[PDB]
Ligand SMILES: Cc1cc2c(ncn2C2CN(C(=O)c3ccn(CC4CCN([C@H]5C=CCCCC5)CC4)c3)C2)c(N)n1
Ligand SMILES: [Cl-]
């Protein structure tokens with residue numbers, strides 16, 4: 001997080017990261033070891049707790065029987081963090097339920113006790129310097145923070161020395177906006193982590209780098225050419241959506257609005273909210289009304305995922321698209337969102353043919369709307385590839401897997417484990 005790069009003051013943005021040497025597409029700018037990290041509960045059996053390596057036959061922790069490790073080195077090395085939960089899981093059993101944010105924050109506190117001094121993950125930005133945005137948080141968020149502090153005390157009281165409430169409020173607020181989610185090759189949620197030097201990068205909607213993970217190591221690779229003196233920009237938000245949506249998301253979490261070329265011009269708003277070529281052109285009240293509808297349905301579906309059944313979820317996706325299609329083309333990003341969700345439901349039901357059908361409809365417009373080396377696009381191709389291969393559509397499967405590899409070679413690097421894994425899926 002230092003070679004050929006420096007920390008600097010980005011005008012209008014704040015502290016950021018600047019290139020001192022050229023980078024080409026695919027080049028590693030830096031990697032950043034996790035300051036703190038946690039494997040999500042639902043991936044326990046499938047990944048090592050320490051290093052996140054996926055493989056069959058992982059060795060169980062003999063003390064709690066809940067954690068899984070590659071070997072005794074992984075087990076020994078994870079202990080300073082694992083010790084925060086090992087006995088507590090035995091004590092609490094099925095009542096053990098700290099949120100992932102609480103789990104990550106407990107680790108931060110343990111890390112601060114064992115290694116109080118600057119770590120390699122903090123070459124340019126320290127965890128203590130993270131923005132909390134505490135003065136901008138509403139009462140609901142502050143209430144949620146108090147519930148996290150209560151939970152932290154409740155589940156970890158035998159294993160941490162707690163700072164005072166005011167300090168923990170700041171730390172939870174910092175975790176809330178600075179934590180990264182680590183996702184696998186299909187963008188499935190693996191865990192949460194703190195990558196301080198990665199957190200230094202400012203936001204653009206035409207970013208020049210992409211963040212990926214090799215185990216718990218964050219890696220930062222160029223997705224456009226970067227010249228000496230140029231700022232290194234990552235994206236904090238999902239780039240599928242139009243300018244207002246993007247900025248609503250930025251405002252919600254980080255209390256700023258973007259000033260990049262995409263946001264200034266809004267040149268891709270029309271193509272993203274692609275309107276049908278009707279006989280009578282629609283009127284702005286009807287566009288505005290359908291946009292509002294779409295955004296509300298997306299959000300209602302987000303919640304519905306927790307309590308509704310799979311057939312009810314598909315019905316929502318189908319009905320939403322039927323209503324939206326008065327005004328929107330199928331390549332419209334809001335239509336794609338719902339198809340993407342319907343694809344998710346099919347994969348969950350193990351309806352492999354139905355999932356393939358949705359994926360086939362998503363992929364080409366989805367790829368046009370995202371930047372060239374989007375992990376969202378790579379993930380979609382990978383899912384198609386695997387669906388095709390399972391149904392013995394070999395040529396289509398090879399082709400989709402190779403489209404995924406093409407993106408991933410740039411984003412993850414050519415020697416990444418995922419690529420070796422996917423190349424073996426083709427050679428098979
Ligand atoms: C006016 C202005 C200011 C700008 C800007 N770009 C950046 N800024 C500054 C940095 N700002 C923050 O408030 C902030 C607070 C914290 N972090 C780091 C986390 C970001 C999210 N990720 C990830 C979070 C979750 C997972 C998804 C990927 C993003 C973590 C580090 C940044 C305003 C710009 N273009 N304009
Ligand atoms: Cl977003």
Ligand SMILES: [Zn+2]
Nearest residue numbers: 061063064086
């Ligand atoms: Zn254990």
Ligand SMILES: [Zn+2]
Nearest residue numbers: 048051070074
């Ligand atoms: Zn391991």
Ligand SMILES: [Zn+2]
Nearest residue numbers: 205258260263
């Ligand atoms: Zn922007």
